[PDB]
Subunit: 329 residues, 4 copies
């Protein structure tokens, strides 16, 4: 019964487990932190910036792709401004080799068919949704995220199916889900990238009010096991304590983790600067100065596990559970 087999089911967070070290002939220099989400969406680092208005504008989106990651423009702005941001990220020096100057010192840039760097944009389910997407695709966007707090509402699985039949070339990133059965629902709907983030962090703290949610580690693990039957990558929204948890997330079966908070202090994020230092997280600095901490930490984490790439990381991953007594320290 669905009233008998419920209670015993156990959940798990990132902090509750540790990755078991392996015989490593692999070094952080050698390791590959690249993941393929699509032909269009070829990332060189497993990171995406959230589509938050306090996280990613055009100033922020460019910085991510310059490194090799991905920027998701926020939907909390007029389409005119929104459609411009995407193409502004697309027009910086993107789509041409003419500016070798920009090619000269951003080694691991992630790019599309035209050699343009990759940018994504958030699209709401608010009633005039398609018009907000027609401007972005024609702004040559590479991806859009149809996400709500109702991240698995029929309406949010609706405007996914209403787009795939409409658009051949658009990569639909869907979310958020918490279960493997909810992963399939998005994928069958027309989702080539699935996002896991129900009660991920404080982004949708419905645990205290709605009382709903699934522990992120298991949420990442379960969904990834289902999305692999279609070769579809998953996005690890929230749950991350530090970059050591990136190592735990990318081993559960994830291709990319997406972050918001860690971008609250960088200069490329929206927020009037002030010399003490705070925006309108106080300050963090250049995005290039924060990224290598995330990457370096992941490099050694898989250099510890003998993972050359992110694929072998998942196939040959074993965890070990910590007791609830002395885990905080």
């Amino acid at each position: 019964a669905m009233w008998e087999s419920k209670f015993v089911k156990e959940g798990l967070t990132f902090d509750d487990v540790l990755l078991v070290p392996a015989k490593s002939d692999v070094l952080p220099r050698e390791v590959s932190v690249k993941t393929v989400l699509s032909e269009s969406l070829q990332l060189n680092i497993p990171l995406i910036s959230a589509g938050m208005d306090t996280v990613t504008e055009a100033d922020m989106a460019i910085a991510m792709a310059r490194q090799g990651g991905l920027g998701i423009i926020h939907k909390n702005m007029s389409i005119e401004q929104q459609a411009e941001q995407v193409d502004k990220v697309k027009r910086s020096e993107s789509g041409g080799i003419k500016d070798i100057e920009k090619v000269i010192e951003f080694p691991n840039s992630a790019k599309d068919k035209q050699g343009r760097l990759l940018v994504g944009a958030a699209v709401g389910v608010t009633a005039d949704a398609m018009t907000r997407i027609d401007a972005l695709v024609k702004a040559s966007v590479d991806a859009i995220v149809l996400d709500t707090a109702h991240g698995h509402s029929q309406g949010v699985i609706d405007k996914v199916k209403e787009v795939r039949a409409k658009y051949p070339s658009l990569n639909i990133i869907a979310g958020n889900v918490a279960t493997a059965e909810a992963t399939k629902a998005l994928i069958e709907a027309g989702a080539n990238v699935v996002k896991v983030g129900i009660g991920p962090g404080s982004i949708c703290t419905t645990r205290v009010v709605a009382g709903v949610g699934v522990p992120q580690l298991t949420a990442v693990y379960d969904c990834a096991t289902e999305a692999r039957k279609h070769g579809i990558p998953v996005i690890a929204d929230g749950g991350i304590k530090y970059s050591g948890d990136m190592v735990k997330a990318l081993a559960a079966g994830a291709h990319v983790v997406m972050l918001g908070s860690m971008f609250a202090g960088v200069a490329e994020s929206p927020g009037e600067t002030e010399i003490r230092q705070f925006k309108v997280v106080p300050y963090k600095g250049p995005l290039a100065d924060t990224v290598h901490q995330l990457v370096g930490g992941l490099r050694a984490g898989m250099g510890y596990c003998g993972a050359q790439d992110l694929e072998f990381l998942r196939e040959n991953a074993q965890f070990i559970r910590m007791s609830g007594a002395g885990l905080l320290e």
Copy 2:
């Protein structure tokens, strides 16, 4: 062997689990918060105000009755003064009674358009003589609460009430065992209040007894359902997220006590010192804004789980255990 088998019983409270979502066609607005306790005892929201001295009198009950819930008028004053308060919540509406229906659409009344009201009665020697006045004031639910919750003493006075005049709804508590929940049902109980031990009632520090509430609710609700009997969960409800768990654990309604303390509709004088008012404790204010909050978020939880009514919620209720670092 109650010596070599006792140890393995593991318990759980609401703050140890989470409700797993479902493929939801259902959304908050559509869902129905309505809940039925009996023939004359039926609500529109799964909320009752506890029978405490600082929480519920005629003032609180009227608001609760109109908001769709129920109030339980305490047993610590004159019988006539408990009779004076009941009918006051009864003669609020009496059927060309028109204006108040527009005031709030969720009103919970009887078959004669009269707002429902409950009341606790002590289980002492002069109980039935105090219930005596309550049944004349047409109270819709009597509560048999005592420092002794399930013990034989409380079961005695359910047999006496039901055997003599069986018109009224007998609510009795508290139980924690399925065996205990059923025993009152056989006595004459129609709705059962569940809750022995909150984890900080306060009967675990210097008594060492009790049952974790989440398990206590499930264990009682499962057994009571064998007789088609509804149950009330009493205690363990920390916030808005735990009500949904309590409601998914099997409970029909969720009775809250201290949550309605500083609420404006609580009995007692009002004292102002700061800006925010205070009670003779933070003046919460109009009961609605808290109740609306308690149900406006409840719709989200059910919408997440894809339930249009409290029915679907329990049949397909799925939980997930909070691990070690998840507790923190």
Copy 3:
């Protein structure tokens, strides 16, 4: 994998309420350790200098428990304390009021107040025991932190032989094999409690320790099937652990620290506010502390339908709480 076994304390469990036919009046909280060792309350004062001397032994007896005279004193001076207790109540006409004054007082066949003693485990021990039985002391203890000590067993073998009719309380143990070895030494009463890290540092420096619910159950099981009672040493914070310890199989609960600042403690008094010196503030009479415990014991067994302690530990039903139980 020799790590799997789980050890519980009283902080790890609760008692599940049972069907009760017992009111707080009906229970007998009387307890027997031996034919010459019977008590009216399941309490013992620890054999410490901050805890028990003559007056504490008198007071504890006058409440129904047993006082264990501590051995940090001369051989003559320990016999002196024993003397006072035995000559406390004649059994005649002069001391009848005390019988009226304290109904629950525990005594021997000749109406003399029961008193326990305590000795070391050296060559000097017998010469101390000499003076103790000379003034007719009832119980004797040879207690330290050591668990399966070979030294204590050697003494019990020597003490029981010299005095076949004497209540030897050895301790402390936390294993069945050790408890089995003590009964195999001639003892008839067992102290149980090795390394409760909640209070002492046995676990910190030695790494050795046993959680006090596991130790009690493991020892009470081994001792019971040979007609032997046990005592739970260390790990009781209030009435809660006490009831849990008694249901775990323990006949008596020995307390020292909690009793340390009581009026009958050997500690001196000085002021403002009252305090007990040589540090602990002042509480009051031992009687208040006792009926803060025993009264709660009547409440604990009451929710369980037990009318006697035998009824309790036989039909005890433990529930194992969850991780976030007290935290929330």
Copy 4:
């Protein structure tokens, strides 16, 4: 991937077994190899802030093992690992008498160790040490995920087959064989050994010591090889636990951060070792025997005459995660 359990030191308590042993009898004398016979199961960590030549002298005086730290030139390296060798021969009778428990070589010269890196430089460093009659070297690093360690060990082993190469640092069974079959007669156990460990996130990997120690000591004992605990130990109880878990010797640094012999300056009315300012902890002999006592005390309750006695005979239980600090 997730049901696998890992235990720390705070997870375990040692359970008292047949105490047929007493501290006047028990031996903490531990062996690593024929040329490495220790009298106390401790090893100083080769760190800038832990071991100098002076510290290597005092450590061995009690029968431990001082590993000279790497962060110096090869010149001043071998100068330090030669001072300890010619610190005493029996030429000075009292200087031999004053420290009877001392650990020594064939000529009665103090036992020494030298911290050596993986790299191309190391052979020149190692050879300079073997010229200074070094007893052992440690080829350990957190940079061990470059298998150069394994490459170096055998490389060094081929050249020096009578050398006491200490390899590390591992925490799994399959990596143990990799080190052992590489020629490492001593294998270091531990990944994540910080007083606070941040490598589990900053670097990104780690495993609880008790699990690490026990598991690595399983395959290491199947083919006769002793394991060693690195850091990870805070109290004397932590010593007894992992030792019983199949370990022969424990390594510490931070705990002995501000000793007299430890590198650092003594400043001031209180004394502080500016080694980051660590208060004075006394002579090494003092800060050591506050452990060995508790170590001898832990084996007593278990009833072990030695560590092999302890390793074989000891068994473990598990505490509860619900309360640990609050229940203390």
